[PDB]
Design a binder for this molecule. Structure first.
Ligand SMILES: N[C@@H](Cc1ccc(O)cc1)C(=O)O
Ligand SMILES: N[C@@H](Cc1ccc(O)cc1)C(=O)O
Ligand SMILES: [Mg+2]
Lengths: 785, 266, 159, 157
């Protein structure tokens, strides 16, 4: 909201300056996005009176005869240029913002234009450039520098949060400054009304949408340009003056957050009807836009005989037809309170956001209409020489606000402050609250304009901000937390350790958007995503990821196109969505591998990843096994599931060749698990002091049989005294029955209490050869040294 | 095709020492309470290890610490403010001297915890070491009371043994505190009271030693109008009970079969 | 934060769809309601409170989502850190103390904090805070805060 | 005596006071994650090892040692690491070993050292034979450590 310093100053006369005002509004809860000086007007620009307008034959231009101290002549093409108005004359030699081309005397279509009349845009007061500024013909003595009646202004760009709709009115802001201690000057609406009937009726057919609706009656109007002070005020606030009546309604709206509209009675007919719009019903709004109304749109309509017609889109924008113009003599003034939700939907429905809708959506003083009617009618009387009727047409009777219990002791207790009770009461009073009782708990009933004051807490914020948030001392709380709050951070801590170990093991963390491209369910061969977005950022991000690896594969690609990494060991931890929201851990391996930079031999692919992973779980103290299993997105020959501590928690393998190809990618290896990982408690095993028995033996097995099954068998039967068991050599070929292979196992036995008898070891290996063959496996070596 | 159940590259997998784990847990427990961890030197001056802590020579109280006395020229022992400190050198018999060093170097209020290797001339058995670790605590400031010391240890217990844990305080003697106290925590699983450490309100003479050394260094007094509590607890005893380690001697044994058993432990 | 409440606009929401999804409440129950991507970590303070008892101090980091246009200083996907301290006698003086400590911890002894009233449907008083960054010589608007709103505690105990 | 907890803003000179301790802790943790096994060794030294391991004589000695084998204060960290390697080879027969220890050393001034030990066949496929080991395996792990720590690591002759 634009806050023109000198305008606000009219309500708060003692304001020190815009800078101090910015400070004061900040502590009140309003942040200024920017301060700006706005109306520099050179001395060359003077006030002039248009004595006569003479169209130049053969052109669409006019020769203006201006009284500017001395009679001067200027040529204009502005449609509004006409006799009887005052204008902004830029004398030859003037430096104008808009043009940057020094103004001069020049010949246009046969006449010497001694300078030129200005539009808001040329003078630099507004963006409007389609017509001349129109001033009262007597605003100033002809020829006086406009500066002298139009001084520069400083405007603050104020943020007005949804809770302070009363602040959408300059007087609302004034009251806050008042609570701080500044003197307040409320405009007195001096009205000289006359008792007589209003020549029209009011019929509110939809009280839901128009809870409180009033109509003022002003006639004998003399529509003309607004005084300079008003045009200056309106322009500073971002609005464009139009004329007497229209400006007055905009001025009051900006003054007290109360949108209002003057309807020319010529079009009202018998009366105003606040009703819902009938389907199809058309309306040419003020913006010149021809619209089609929806049955949910609240409408301000008129009726004549057996006909009802729309006059304006209620609380959003008046109709173009009944707009008040120069020939208007009488109006019906609309000052109402509309249902916020209705205004909200209508506004969206038609793509409109106006000074009016904005205020009605945020809320209007439920009992501010009548006072607003007097302010406006008073101004109309003063500026449009309006005769005003004593009575109003009113429908609806809102109830005043209720009392709120308030305890100075609680305010101080909640804030941690010690403001003396009297200061608290006084503040609430300065904000217009009524305070009753004598404590310790008072009856505080707020002003109707404060929709944000309903609870005691609300009142304590009032005391706090008027006292100043900086007066609240600093402190630290001390307490023994309730029992059920213990160890509550274990889960979070667990995952953090995991990430840290990964980064230390050699993995590079990566963050990827939670979004997924529905089409990738296809590309990466994955079941379709369960959750989809109703309002995606793009179709590429229309779903919620189900896996972590697809994104990891895509970043591998993007990293290969921007830079050309030779290798890459990545990891990412993230939330996945399928049936339930769950946390996954995915890793990606890629590149030549590990080895000597100058040499050539290297470790890579599947077994490099299975290597790092074995370390991870060794580091984590958890059992890690990888059995063979097929996965749509994995190479059938390089694919297996992961078994941490005995339970299936994910997979590991090479990215399917077909997938790799469609993505133009070299072989890629990866895995994905579900968190939190199984947890294995410590079971310290005191190490035996005595020596351990060493024994070797190879196992003859068919090439198909997986390593795991063998190792499981060898161990399973190796006995309760087995210490180690490691594969130190895989061999398949002659002299072994082709399609067969031998598994060189390094065994070690040991006994906690004493040393082992060769009888027990021999037996051990024997118990092994037993089932080892019972399964169909040979023994290339036995009792091997 | 490839056997996926085949062992992968034998990349090494590290691990942390039991004491590092226990100390880390203790340090975390207290960080949550606002304590910061700082360390002191293993080789100390008798001044900091004893004199500054109200422990005279040929004082019966000296016997509560069997000391390793050192020798050798060319060694530079730096005081709290980097200065060249003097006095008979020894291996600190406890972390307590560090609370004197910290105080000359800082100003109250504060909360510190100082873990550290300590040395006592003793015979190494199943539950005794000549080289072990302690965790000292020190909270100084206006209004600090014994009620706060008890609160600290209550939190230590809860954090270590769960909601069904309890603490117990009994008077005990230390030249550097008055009141002095020993505290035990209830261990619901083992169903028994564990004597954890000593503690009390920092002794008047300790604050006096601190401010004297400060003045002797040009610093202004800082502990005239404050009080504080201090505690000290043995780590090995706790680590043992917490990991089920039977012989205190394993810690410095260096046996991998032993160390390796704590890779999982966070 | 009602529907068709002006305050709803302070959060551009990603609304989701799809059957078969199970959203579990604070006590593992099957919660219902229109699904969306959380526009902030705040909902977590409601979940925690139904599941625990005061007094306590929690901090909840988290990925959040807003329907917005991605530029140099704006994201549709970012992170927030929520704080919540509840208990008998907890006052705004403590909130300020917390943030004072945050600043000191983040920018050193010469750092300072600043509080100004601001609006949030879930707090009253409401406030925005900025911390002085001595090096960059400027105030950084860090976050919002305030005293938990009465209606929030009410929602918690009703659930 | 009731139970209570203190509340106060700590004096300024107490800020970040824990950085040093935290720094070393991170170091240990990264080492354990990179693949190094932590080890704790007595601060004592055998005066005779100054000879065996070719080291300048120990500066601090014990007036009341536990035994002459522990009569001095260690000056290096590696000698003890080498001795545990030996003891581990006599009790159990480790094939490999990547160790690390952080500890206080004494010489001129008390200082903190970080020592590491590599030993064994090396890294590679258990069933295969090609392997990475010795000097360049250690220089490998070390390069990672400093890459991880974000520090320049060079090794001149
Ligand atoms: N657009 C209206 C302003 C307004 C809008 C809605 C109202 O209900 C009242 C006034 C006008 O030009 O006057
Ligand atoms: N320092 C004492 C234990 C202790 C520590 C701190 C105290 O406040 C009291 C006692 C010891 O070595 O046993
Ligand atoms: Mg409020």
């Amino acid at each position: 909201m634009r806050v023109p310093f000198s305008w606000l100053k009219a309500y708060v006369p003692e304001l020190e300056s815009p800078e101090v005002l910015e400070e004061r509004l900040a502590g009140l809860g309003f942040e200024t996005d920017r301060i700006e000086r706005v109306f520099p007007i050179p001395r060359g620009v003077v006030f002039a009176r248009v004595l006569e307008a003479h169209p130049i034959p053969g052109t669409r231009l006019k020769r203006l005869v201006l009284d500017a101290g001395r009679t001067v002549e200027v040529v204009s093409g502005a449609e509004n240029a006409r006799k009887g108005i005052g204008v902004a004359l830029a004398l030859p030699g003037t430096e104008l913002p808009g043009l940057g081309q020094k103004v001069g005397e020049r010949v246009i279509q046969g006449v010497r234009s001694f300078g030129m009349a200005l539009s808001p845009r040329e003078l630099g007061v507004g963006e409007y450039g389609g017509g001349l500024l129109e001033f009262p013909e007597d605003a100033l003595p002809p020829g006086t520098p406009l500066s002298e009646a139009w001084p520069e202004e400083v405007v603050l760009d104020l943020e007005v949060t949804p809770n302070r709709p009363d602040a959408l009115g300059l007087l609302g802001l004034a009251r806050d400054l008042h609570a701080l201690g500044y003197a307040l000057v409320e405009p007195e609406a001096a009205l000289k009304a006359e008792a007589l009937p209003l020549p029209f009726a009011l019929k509110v057919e939809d009280p839901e949408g128009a809870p409180h609706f009033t109509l003022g009656y002003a006639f004998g109007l003399r529509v003309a340009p607004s005084p300079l002070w008003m045009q200056r005020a309106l322009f500073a606030a971002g609005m464009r003056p139009i004329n007497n009546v229209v400006d007055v309604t905009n001025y009051v709206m900006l003054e007290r957050a109360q949108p209002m509209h003057a309807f020319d009675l010529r079009f009202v007919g018998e009366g105003i009807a606040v009703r819902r719009a009938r389907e199809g019903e058309r309306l040419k709004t003020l913006d010149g836009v021809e619209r089609t109304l929806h049955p949910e749109d609240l409408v301000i309509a008129g009726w004549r005989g057996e006909e009802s017609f729309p006059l304006g889109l209620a609380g959003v924008m008046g109709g173009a037809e009944s707009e008040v113009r120069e020939d208007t003599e009488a109006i019906a003034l609309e000052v109402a309170c509309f249902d916020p939700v209705s205004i909200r939907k209508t506004a969206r429905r038609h793509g409109l956001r106006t000074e009016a809708s904005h205020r009605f959506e945020r809320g209007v003083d439920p009992l501010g209409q009548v006072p607003a009617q007097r302010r406006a009618l008073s101004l109309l009387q003063a500026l449009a020489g309006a005769r005003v009727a004593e009575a109003l047409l009113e429908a609806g009777s809102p109830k005043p606000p209720e009392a709120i219990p308030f305890r100075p002791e609680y305010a101080n207790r909640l804030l941690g402050t010690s403001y003396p009770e009297a200061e608290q009461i006084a503040i609430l009073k300065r904000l217009g609250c009524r305070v009753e009782g004598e404590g310790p708990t008072y009856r505080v009933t707020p002003p109707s304009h404060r929709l944000d004051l309903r609870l005691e807490e609300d009142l304590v914020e009032e005391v706090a901000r008027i006292q100043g948030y900086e007066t609240i001392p600093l402190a630290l709380p001390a307490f023994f937390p309730a029992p059920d709050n213990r160890g509550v951070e274990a889960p979070y801590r667990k995952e953090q350790r995991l990430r840290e170990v990964l980064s230390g093991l050699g993995f590079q963390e990566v963050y990827t958007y939670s979004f997924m491209d529905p089409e990738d369910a296809r590309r990466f061969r994955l079941d379709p995503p369960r959750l989809l977005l109703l309002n995606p950022l793009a179709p590429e991000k229309a779903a919620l990821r189900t896996h972590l690896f697809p994104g990891l594969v895509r970043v591998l690609k993007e990293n290969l196109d921007l830079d050309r990494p030779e290798r890459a060991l990545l990891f990412e931890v993230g939330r996945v969505f399928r049936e339930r929201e769950e946390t996954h851990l995915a890793g990606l391996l890629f590149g030549e591998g590990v080895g000597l930079p100058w040499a050539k031999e290297r470790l890579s692919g599947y077994f490099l990843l299975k290597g790092y992973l074995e370390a991870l779980f060794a580091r984590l103290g958890l059992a890690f096994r990888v059995e063979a299993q097929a996965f749509p997105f994995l190479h059938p020959g390089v694919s297996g599931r992961v078994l941490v501590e005995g339970e299936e928690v994910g997979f590991l393998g090479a990215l399917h060749p077909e997938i790799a190809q469609e993505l133009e990618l070299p072989p890629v290896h990866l895995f994905e698990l579900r968190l939190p990982l199984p947890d294995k408690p410590l079971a310290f095993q005191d190490p035996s002091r005595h020596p351990a028995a060493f024994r070797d033996l190879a196992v003859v097995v068919p090439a198909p049989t997986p390593y795991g099954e063998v190792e499981a068998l060898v161990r399973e039967a190796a006995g309760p005294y087995l210490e180690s068991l490691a594969l130190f050599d895989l061999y398949q070929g002659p002299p072994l029955p082709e399609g067969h292979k031998s598994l060189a196992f390094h065994l070690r036995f040991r006994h906690p209490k004493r040393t082992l008898r060769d009888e027990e070891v021999e037996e051990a290996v024997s118990r092994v050869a037993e089932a080892l063959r019972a399964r169909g496996f040979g023994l290339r070596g036995l009792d091997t040294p | 095709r490839v056997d996926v159940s085949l062992p992968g590259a034998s990349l090494f997998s590290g691990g942390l020492h039991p004491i590092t784990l226990m100390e880390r847990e203790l340090v975390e427990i207290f960080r949550a309470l606002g304590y910061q961890a700082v360390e002191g030197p293993e080789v100390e001056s008798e001044f900091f290890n004893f004199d500054a802590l109200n422990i005279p020579e040929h004082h019966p109280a000296r016997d509560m610490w069997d000391t390793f006395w050192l020798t050798g020229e060319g060694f530079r022992l730096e005081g709290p403010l980097g200065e060249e400190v003097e006095g008979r050198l020894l291996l600190r018999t406890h972390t307590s001297p560090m609370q004197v060093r910290y105080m000359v170097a800082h100003t109250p209020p504060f909360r510190i915890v100082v873990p550290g290797r300590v040395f006592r001339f003793e015979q190494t058995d199943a539950t005794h070491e000549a080289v072990f670790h302690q965790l000292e605590g020190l909270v100084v400031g206006e209004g600090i009371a014994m009620a706060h010391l008890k609160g600290a240890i209550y939190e230590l217990a809860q954090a270590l043994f769960g909601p069904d844990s309890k603490v117990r305080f009994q008077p005990v003697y230390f030249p550097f505190v008055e009141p002095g106290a020993q505290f035990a925590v209830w261990w619901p699983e083992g169903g028994k009271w564990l004597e954890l450490g000593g503690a009390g309100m920092v002794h008047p003479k300790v604050f006096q030693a601190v401010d004297a050394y400060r003045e002797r260094l040009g610093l202004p007094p800082a502990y005239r109008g404050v009080t504080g509590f201090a505690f000290g607890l043995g780590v090995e005893r706790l680590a043992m009970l917490r990991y089920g380690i039977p012989d205190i001697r394993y810690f410095f044994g260096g046996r991998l079969k032993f160390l390796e058993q704590f890779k999982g432990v966070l």
